[PDB]
Design an enzyme around this catalytic site. Structure first.
Site, PDB file in Angstrom:
ATOM      1  N   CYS A 199      38.951  27.856  22.963  1.00  0.00           N
ATOM      2  CA  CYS A 199      37.982  26.916  24.054  1.00  0.00           C
ATOM      3  C   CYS A 199      37.032  25.962  23.458  1.00  0.00           C
ATOM      4  O   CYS A 199      36.129  26.564  23.122  1.00  0.00           O
ATOM      5  CB  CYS A 199      37.391  27.961  25.141  1.00  0.00           C
ATOM      6  SG  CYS A 199      36.476  27.109  26.372  1.00  0.00           S
ATOM      7  N   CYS A 242      33.858  25.606  25.288  1.00  0.00           N
ATOM      8  CA  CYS A 242      33.060  26.627  25.312  1.00  0.00           C
ATOM      9  C   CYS A 242      32.380  26.601  23.926  1.00  0.00           C
ATOM     10  O   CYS A 242      31.265  26.630  23.813  1.00  0.00           O
ATOM     11  CB  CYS A 242      33.779  27.985  25.403  1.00  0.00           C
ATOM     12  SG  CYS A 242      34.917  28.366  26.909  1.00  0.00           S
ATOM     13  N   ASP A 243      33.065  26.751  22.803  1.00  0.00           N
ATOM     14  CA  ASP A 243      32.533  26.892  21.368  1.00  0.00           C
ATOM     15  C   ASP A 243      32.513  25.734  20.558  1.00  0.00           C
ATOM     16  O   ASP A 243      32.104  25.902  19.355  1.00  0.00           O
ATOM     17  CB  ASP A 243      33.211  28.153  20.619  1.00  0.00           C
ATOM     18  CG  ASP A 243      33.323  29.136  21.647  1.00  0.00           C
ATOM     19  OD1 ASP A 243      32.804  29.707  22.488  1.00  0.00           O
ATOM     20  OD2 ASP A 243      34.550  29.865  21.667  1.00  0.00           O
TER      21      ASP A 243
HETATM   22  C1  LIG Z   1      37.505  33.924  23.697  1.00  0.00           C
HETATM   23  C2  LIG Z   1      37.072  33.327  25.040  1.00  0.00           C
HETATM   24  C3  LIG Z   1      35.912  32.759  25.084  1.00  0.00           C
HETATM   25  C4  LIG Z   1      35.416  32.171  26.475  1.00  0.00           C
HETATM   26  N1  LIG Z   1      34.065  31.554  26.403  1.00  0.00           N
HETATM   27  C5  LIG Z   1      33.580  30.906  27.518  1.00  0.00           C
HETATM   28  C6  LIG Z   1      32.669  30.373  27.569  1.00  0.00           C
HETATM   29  O1  LIG Z   1      31.596  30.563  26.968  1.00  0.00           O
HETATM   30  N2  LIG Z   1      32.313  29.901  28.980  1.00  0.00           N
HETATM   31  C7  LIG Z   1      33.175  29.674  29.852  1.00  0.00           C
HETATM   32  O2  LIG Z   1      32.714  29.068  31.142  1.00  0.00           O
HETATM   33  N3  LIG Z   1      34.210  30.010  29.700  1.00  0.00           N
HETATM   34  C8  LIG Z   1      34.780  30.961  28.975  1.00  0.00           C
HETATM   35  N4  LIG Z   1      36.067  31.481  28.656  1.00  0.00           N
HETATM   36  C9  LIG Z   1      36.823  31.410  29.790  1.00  0.00           C
HETATM   37  C10 LIG Z   1      36.546  32.204  30.813  1.00  0.00           C
HETATM   38  O3  LIG Z   1      36.305  33.587  30.189  1.00  0.00           O
HETATM   39  C11 LIG Z   1      37.748  32.346  31.779  1.00  0.00           C
HETATM   40  O4  LIG Z   1      38.012  31.022  32.473  1.00  0.00           O
HETATM   41  C12 LIG Z   1      37.464  33.259  33.141  1.00  0.00           C
HETATM   42  O5  LIG Z   1      36.958  34.449  32.621  1.00  0.00           O
HETATM   43  C13 LIG Z   1      38.623  33.587  33.885  1.00  0.00           C
HETATM   44  O6  LIG Z   1      38.137  34.355  35.003  1.00  0.00           O
HETATM   45  P1  LIG Z   1      39.267  35.240  35.787  1.00  0.00           P
HETATM   46  O7  LIG Z   1      38.542  36.122  36.587  1.00  0.00           O
HETATM   47  O8  LIG Z   1      40.077  34.224  36.507  1.00  0.00           O
HETATM   48  O9  LIG Z   1      40.420  35.857  34.733  1.00  0.00           O
HETATM   49  P2  LIG Z   1      40.040  36.785  33.304  1.00  0.00           P
HETATM   50  O10 LIG Z   1      38.817  36.497  32.750  1.00  0.00           O
HETATM   51  O11 LIG Z   1      41.240  36.933  32.499  1.00  0.00           O
HETATM   52  O12 LIG Z   1      39.783  38.247  34.034  1.00  0.00           O
HETATM   53  C14 LIG Z   1      40.817  38.910  34.640  1.00  0.00           C
HETATM   54  C15 LIG Z   1      40.607  40.616  34.521  1.00  0.00           C
HETATM   55  O13 LIG Z   1      41.486  41.282  35.310  1.00  0.00           O
HETATM   56  C16 LIG Z   1      42.193  42.050  34.660  1.00  0.00           C
HETATM   57  N5  LIG Z   1      43.713  42.261  35.359  1.00  0.00           N
HETATM   58  C17 LIG Z   1      44.868  41.596  35.172  1.00  0.00           C
HETATM   59  N6  LIG Z   1      45.688  42.142  35.616  1.00  0.00           N
HETATM   60  C18 LIG Z   1      45.452  43.341  36.128  1.00  0.00           C
HETATM   61  C19 LIG Z   1      45.885  44.305  36.705  1.00  0.00           C
HETATM   62  N7  LIG Z   1      47.412  44.412  37.063  1.00  0.00           N
HETATM   63  N8  LIG Z   1      45.597  45.301  37.136  1.00  0.00           N
HETATM   64  C20 LIG Z   1      44.046  45.546  36.971  1.00  0.00           C
HETATM   65  N9  LIG Z   1      43.254  44.561  36.270  1.00  0.00           N
HETATM   66  C21 LIG Z   1      44.100  43.493  35.835  1.00  0.00           C
HETATM   67  C22 LIG Z   1      42.245  41.680  33.323  1.00  0.00           C
HETATM   68  O14 LIG Z   1      42.601  42.603  32.432  1.00  0.00           O
HETATM   69  C23 LIG Z   1      40.949  40.768  32.988  1.00  0.00           C
HETATM   70  O15 LIG Z   1      40.190  41.941  32.762  1.00  0.00           O
HETATM   71  C24 LIG Z   1      36.321  32.010  27.370  1.00  0.00           C
HETATM   72  C25 LIG Z   1      37.538  32.528  27.350  1.00  0.00           C
HETATM   73  C26 LIG Z   1      37.863  33.177  26.057  1.00  0.00           C
HETATM   74  C27 LIG Z   1      39.314  33.859  25.810  1.00  0.00           C
END
Ligand SMILES: Cc1cc2nc3c(=O)[nH]c(=O)nc-3n(C[C@H](O)[C@H](O)[C@H](O)COP(=O)(O)OP(=O)(O)OC[C@H]3O[C@@H](n4cnc5c(N)ncnc54)[C@H](O)[C@@H]3O)c2cc1C
Ligand SMILES: Cc1cc2nc3c(=O)[nH]c(=O)nc-3n(C[C@H](O)[C@H](O)[C@H](O)COP(=O)(O)OP(=O)(O)OC[C@H]3O[C@@H](n4cnc5c(N)ncnc54)[C@H](O)[C@@H]3O)c2cc1C
Ligand SMILES: [Mg+2]
Ligand SMILES: [Mg+2]
Lengths: 305, 305
Positions: B132, B135-136
């Site tokens: 990202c 982000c970083d």
């Molecule tokens: C390394 C990294 C660094 C980042 N740093 C930043 C930052 O500094 N700032 C920022 O704004 N964004 C950052 N992001 C992006 C941000 O983390 C994501 O955009 C955001 O977390 C997305 O949220 P979400 O809830 O849609 O999904 P996710 O964060 O992907 O969360 C989904 C969760 O649901 C769980 N899940 C999935 N399928 C199932 C299932 N069948 N049963 C049970 N649980 C399940 C997954 O395992 C996961 O734990 C970063 C991303 C990464 C990879």
């Protein structure tokens, strides 16, 4: 001096846009207003903003946001924008007798909740007077409260609130309701809701917190007092689109229209976020998400120039 | 027992939906996964999430969100959903050999960033390996870094990063690029970007932080080492829509489609939030805003039943 981006507004949308734009090295120039900090500056505890397991006050949260923007280099000005020229490659904002220009503008002026305009309403805000059932309904468990309004908003607030309140008196200054028939019959079906038509609040009473409302019949003038410990005002919202009317496309209620699921307005280089656009969710966390989106849109658009 | 709402996922979208649904007295049942906490559990400092003037680590933020949901009565289960039945008045999720049912389901499974799958990539995540630029990118000022990918994503990450980095080496395993011609020529026009086609990373080196990458030519097999202190992986994202394929409508890349600016999917009583839906912004604050919207949608829809 033509800045990359100017942001108008300092609620969650404007400060989140500022944080992202500043961290992206765009050196955003932000006009916060003299009544800066957005709607949360005017409440007490905020409990549904994710990230604070024990909550945080509105002003505490908004100061974190402001300091965060400052940390990354946002240029914050506690002044009102009085007029804008948004068409063309170089946009101008007028602040009193000063002018500032930018390649992109992010509109984050929010929306005003319509006020009753009665004595006590402002003083007791956050102490029993609320504009948001989703936000504060929680705190009125087993209490007798009023909701004011005649539209779908008021019907939704009143019916939602009966999951906490002991009783809900829904007050409306006419005997006809602009709310949809479905919402109206949902409220009529609710055993905890009593309607008071042709009725207005003239004063809200309360030593530290709301203790009652003074009522007046809008036809006969008969007055009385109702004992209640909460007043929810749901008489509508007014998006703050006055600056941009005639320049960016608005819907019939004055909200700034955006393209698809983006923040792009009808004008090139102009982006809009927060409750200026959203008439559906109207939460701090949704406004913050849209302000981030506006700054990513603006960054991407600037890159194409 | 048929619950009002089940939430699948525990990133910012799922926990924000849980906070709102729990505070609305819906008693949400949340399946977090065994790899719970979303993408931020797998990073270090989060600086652009509004509300933290000095930042907060990914795990610290996500634990606040989890504790917040718990405080309001969310029933959290650290288990994976293995199959769903989403059509009809009563939805079923299957968790190992246990079944749970609900009137509404909020899909918040997120999206996986595609991995290089090489030694060092996982160990050095948050210590020089990132997915990202928004982000970083900040933390790589005046450094030599690599970006991996051949699409618009990689072109955007590489060009954005040159505002911080001393140099950007863009690596792609073929000599043809799937990125649009405009993005491709923007990167070619950037003086700080060097292309390395027909090239793959086989290992990422670094005692505590990234110090270099081992490279291999995908045609000749020639290997060498490049000294760099950052690796940005931009080879695409895979929305986690496997559970719901064939039940809810997806676009061609597997993202869950939603109606207009809401979270409503193609199936009645099923709502979708976060990076499972959003292939444009992909930030914690935008995912959190969409999770709030999903819970307001679900509340409103349940009220109409
Ligand atoms: C390394 C990294 C660094 C980042 N740093 C930043 C930052 O500094 N700032 C920022 O704004 N964004 C950052 N992001 C992006 C941000 O983390 C994501 O955009 C955001 O977390 C997305 O949220 P979400 O809830 O849609 O999904 P996710 O964060 O992907 O969360 C989904 C969760 O649901 C769980 N899940 C999935 N399928 C199932 C299932 N069948 N049963 C049970 N649980 C399940 C997954 O395992 C996961 O734990 C970063 C991303 C990464 C990879
Ligand atoms: C009493 C109250 C309590 C609330 N409690 C909660 C809660 O607990 N949780 C929750 O999620 N939401 C809550 N909300 C809703 C939340 O505050 C809003 O949805 C959110 O703040 C909207 O953000 P916004 O940035 O779009 O606009 P706003 O918050 O309205 O901020 C816009 C700002 O820009 C300024 N501005 C406008 N025009 C100009 C101009 N021309 N020049 C300069 N500055 C200008 C305004 O003065 C204002 O300071 C509450 C709202 C109210 C009224
Ligand atoms: Mg305000
Ligand atoms: Mg994860």
């Amino acid at each position: 001096t033509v800045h990359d981006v100017i942001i108008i507004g300092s609620g969650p949308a404007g400060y989140t846009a500022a944080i992202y734009a500043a961290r992206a090295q765009l050196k955003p120039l932000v006009f916060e207003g003299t009544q800066f900090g957005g709607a949360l500056m005017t409440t007490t505890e905020v409990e549904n903003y994710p990230g604070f397991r024990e909550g945080i006050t509105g002003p505490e949260l908004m100061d974190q946001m402001r300091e965060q923007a400052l940390r990354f280099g946002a240029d914050l000005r506690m002044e009102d924008v009085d007029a804008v020229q948004l068409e063309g490659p170089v946009k101008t904002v007028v602040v009193g007798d000063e002018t500032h220009q930018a390649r992109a503008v992010i509109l984050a002026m929010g929306a005003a909740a319509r006020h009753l305009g009665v004595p006590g309403e402002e003083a007791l805000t956050g102490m029993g007077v609320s504009t948001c059932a989703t936000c504060d309904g929680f705190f009125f468990r087993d209490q007798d409260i009023v909701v004011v309004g005649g539209g779908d908003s008021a019907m939704e607030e009143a019916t939602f609130l009966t999951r906490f309140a002991r009783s809900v008196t829904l007050i409306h200054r006419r005997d006809e309701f602009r709310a949809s028939k479905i919402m109206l019959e949902r409220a009529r079906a609710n055993e905890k809701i009593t309607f008071l038509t042709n009725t207005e609040i003239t004063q809200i009473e309360g030593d530290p917190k709301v203790t009652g409302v003074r009522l007046r019949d809008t036809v006969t003038g008969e007055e009385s007092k109702l004992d209640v410990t909460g007043v929810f005002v749901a008489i509508g919202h007014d998006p703050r689109s006055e600056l941009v009317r005639g320049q960016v496309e608005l819907d019939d209620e004055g909200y700034v229209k955006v393209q698809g699921r983006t923040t792009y307005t009808s004008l090139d280089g102009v982006f809009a976020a927060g409750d200026l656009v959203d008439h559906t969710y109207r939460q701090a966390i949704t406004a913050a998400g849209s302000g981030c989106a506006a700054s990513i849109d603006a960054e991407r658009w600037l890159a194409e120039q």
